[PDB]
């Protein structure tokens, strides 16, 4: 039996948002065992409130928890991009039962546009010794999290051997991805250069690398 | 690092059994019979599946069993079913605070296992000229799509400046990710080496790179 949370809530940077967690007299209304967890997709939930109002060590004083009757509430003030996450409440009930809310996705509205930083790496000596010549185009610090990548061998398009990872949000709240091109040492040494062209929000960043002169 | 230690992953095929551990100290896991286990499917609420070491809440099948020996609690899932593929967490009371593990991803194998290809790249000449010395540890062609990365500066663990992408399925239906360490040129040039350690299916692969006079 789930506790009741709104599926979504939102706020702009620096604003406050309050989200609720409705249970029954025998769980939320029954004791001070209400906890709140903040979870970024693909990461473990982080405890932000326990015993209705208590913050663990390291949780900013911007997160406040309270309860009135059968409804617990979490308020997040001075919203920051890192606060954009899923929030789950829980409460013990009778008979060793532990109830969880269905989660609230809190959206921090209007986050700033950010162009990608692109760094193109030529093949490592270890992999060239291992008869491999992979290039990696590291793409970081971009927002929103959608990019397209094209590769060139000299000035010509590369139509095979390309993989680009699905962008993931990193600790600076901006996206990262890597495009990698698996070349043979012969393909790498036979061209004057390779280039990675990253398109983000209609603007392209191009980087070029060439076989070592060392 | 979480208060209790759980292995980052486990796997098995349908019908197999898996056992996952949760290690603490004598003041938490080994001090009482208060270990709880929680199951969580991506994008869904966690669910309590074991409490007080061995107790199953109503409706949790007997395929799930919990035990404890000294400072280590264990959860066994027998006859693995598709619905068991999830993240599993433990918790315990401590000397009367609550301590948690960092979670174990349990994968019900959907295709053959595949060990990752790990390629470690030193700083590129262009970024060094731009006063950056980012290293990239490319990890590809692995299954299950669960990986843990750690970096070392010489033999010392380095946590600061590390970012690792969430694994994503590539055109060959295997996973890829990259881990990048944002060093300054001073940090890069002043150490003997830097290493990328990739853990997958309980085994660790390490790659090391060191500065050169010419890039």
Residue numbers in the entry:
A (entry chain B): 2 to 215
B (entry chain A): 1 to 95, 97 to 216
From the paper:
VL and CL domains display very different structural properties in the seven crystal structures.
Each of the seven LCs crystallized in a different space group, with distinct crystal packing; the crystallographic resolutions achieved ranged from 2.70 Å (H7) to 1.65 Å (H9). In some cases (H6, H9, H10) CDR3 (residues 89–97) participates in the interface; both CDR3s in the H7 dimer lack electron density, while in M7 and M8 CDR3 residues are located far from the VL–VL interface. In the structures of all H LCs and in M7, the association interface is roughly symmetric, and is located on the five-stranded beta sheet (strands 1, 3, 4, 7, 8), where the 3, 4, 7, 8 strands establish the intermolecular contacts. Analysis of the data shows that the kinetics of proteolysis correlate well with amyloid propensity: H3, H6, H7, H9, and H16 are almost or totally proteolysed after 60 minutes, and more than 50% of H10, H15 and H18 LCs is cleaved after three hours.
